[PDB]
Amino acid sequence: TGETLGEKWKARLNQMSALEFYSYKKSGITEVCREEARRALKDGVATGGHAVSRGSAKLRWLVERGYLQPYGKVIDLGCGRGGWSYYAATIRKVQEVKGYTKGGPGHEEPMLVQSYGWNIVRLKSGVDVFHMAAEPCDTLLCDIGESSSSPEVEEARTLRVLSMVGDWLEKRPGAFCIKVLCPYTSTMMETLERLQRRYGGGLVRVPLSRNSTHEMYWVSGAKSNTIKSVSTTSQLLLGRMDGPRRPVKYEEDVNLGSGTRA
Ligand SMILES: C[n+]1cn([C@@H]2O[C@H](COP(=O)(O)OP(=O)(O)OP(=O)(O)OC[C@H]3O[C@@H](n4cnc5c(N)ncnc54)[C@H](O)[C@@H]3O)[C@@H](O)[C@H]2O)c2nc(N)[nH]c(=O)c21
Numbered sequence: 001t002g003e004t005l006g007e008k009w010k011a012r013l014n015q016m017s018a019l020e021f022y023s024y025k026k027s028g029i030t031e032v033c034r035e036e037a038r039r040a041l042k043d044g045v046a047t048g049g050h051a052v053s054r055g056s057a058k059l060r061w062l063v064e065r066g067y068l069q070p071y072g073k074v075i076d077l078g079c080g081r082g083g084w085s086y087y088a089a090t091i092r093k094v095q096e097v098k099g100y101t102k103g104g105p106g107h108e109e110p111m112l113v114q115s116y117g118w119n120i121v122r123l124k125s126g127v128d129v130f131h132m133a134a135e136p137c138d139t140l141l142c143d144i145g146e147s148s149s150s151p152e153v154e155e156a157r158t159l160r161v162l163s164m165v166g167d168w169l170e171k172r173p174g175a176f177c178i179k180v181l182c183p184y185t186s187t188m189m190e191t192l193e194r195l196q197r198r199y200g201g202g203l204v205r206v207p208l209s210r211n212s213t214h215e216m217y218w219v220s221g222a223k224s225n226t227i228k229s230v231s232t233t234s235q236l237l238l239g240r241m242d243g244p245r246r247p248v249k250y251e252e253d254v255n256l257g258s259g260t261r262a
């Protein structure tokens with residue numbers, strides 16, 4: 001009554017027992033194996049081509065199906081350690097990549113490794129993108145949204161980055177990948193259609209994502225209907241909460257390799 005499918009989903013999620021939530025997080029999702037790569041982020045090995053974060057595999061999932069084909073100048077807002085930046089540098093059509101994150105006592109500190117094409121990567125900490133001016137780009141990236149147990153707080157936060165991203169979409173990317181932390185409220189499906197009407201694109205759910213978050217990524221390579229695509233992911237997560245759990249589909253993490261300009 002009066003609630004969206006996503007709203008009716010997150011309510012039951014907040015009422016799950018500790019074990020009911022633990023066994024449900026990874027049930028039936030796809031996940032990249034990062035064990036041997038975490039022994040690389042600490043051994044100082046920058047040559048092995050490992051990923052710094054799991055975001056490298058997530059973006060590798062999206063770029064490898066035309067959901068976004070980066071090129072020219074690319075920009076990743078909230079790069080953290082640059083999981084999205086180090087994969088974008090391996091793309092052959094891109095030239096300049098710049099990452100930006102604060103990395104203060106509030107969040108993750110950027111890491112610099114030697115993945116293939118690391119010379120074109122510019123990751124600096126100490127930036128607040130909510131007070132940053134938009135620069136011309138051909139590929140916009142944004143992975144900022146922060147979880148919250150209240151569907152209204154996730155809404156109040158997601159509209160803030162979508163209003164900030166409108167200044168970078170005012171710089172007209174050629175291919176973008178914007179994360180919509182909460183797309184499932186009646187105010188959300190409203191705005192996401194309003195932005196797609198003027199700037200194009202569509203939303204898509206990545207199998208790298210957990211069952212605990214309703215996050216979806218607004219891409220430039222998919223033209224899906226908004227309300228139907230969001231509701232599809234809503235109904236998809238609900239079925240996983242009732243029956244017996246299912247094993248996670250493991251995969252090999254990206255291997256960005258090593259090298260220089262080419
Ligand atoms: C940790 N946790 C998260 N969620 C739910 O999953 C959604 C996203 O969960 P997340 O795991 O993706 O979030 P994050 O990326 O920060 O990792 P982590 O698992 O460590 O969760 C930490 C955050 O979850 C929130 N949280 C902690 N405990 C609970 C709880 N009992 N119920 C709801 N939210 C919680 C807190 O705001 C905390 O900051 C949250 O909105 C929440 O409804 C939980 N639900 C139950 N029923 N029991 C839990 O323990 C729980």
Ligand SMILES: Nc1ncnc2c1ncn2[C@@H]1O[C@H](CSCC[C@H](N)C(=O)O)[C@@H](O)[C@H]1O
Pocket residue numbers: 053054055056076077078079080081082083084100101102103107108127128129130143144145
């Ligand atoms: N308001 C803000 N301004 C700048 N960076 C922010 C921000 N809010 C969150 N962030 C940053 O966004 C990052 C998201 S983690 C994403 C990292 C990377 N895109 C990857 O996929 O691997 C966090 O590390 C956090 O530091």
